[PDB]
């Protein structure tokens, strides 16, 4: 077993993806504003 296989599980990629989406939405709102 090379490298941490568990670090490629479902719970790690899903949250970071969602966090990115949220940050994108707030950034979009800021850009549109003014």
């Amino acid at each position: 077993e090379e490298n941490p296989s568990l670090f490629a599980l479902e719970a790690v990629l899903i949250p970071v993806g969602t966090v990115g989406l949220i940050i994108t939405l707030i950034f979009v709102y800021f850009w549109l504003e003014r």
Binding site: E10, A11, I14, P15, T18, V19, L21, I22, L25, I26, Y29
Partner: protein, 31 residues
């Protein structure tokens, strides 16, 4: 049995829904 994905995704999903409501409030026919 509890799952890390379920417990993490529930609060994150709440935050996402809040954001969708935030945009919807200032966007009627804009998508």
């Amino acid at each position: 049995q509890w799952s890390a994905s379920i417990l993490v995704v529930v609060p994150i999903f709440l935050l996402l829904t809040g954001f969708v409501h935030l945009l919807f409030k200032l966007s009627p026919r804009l998508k």
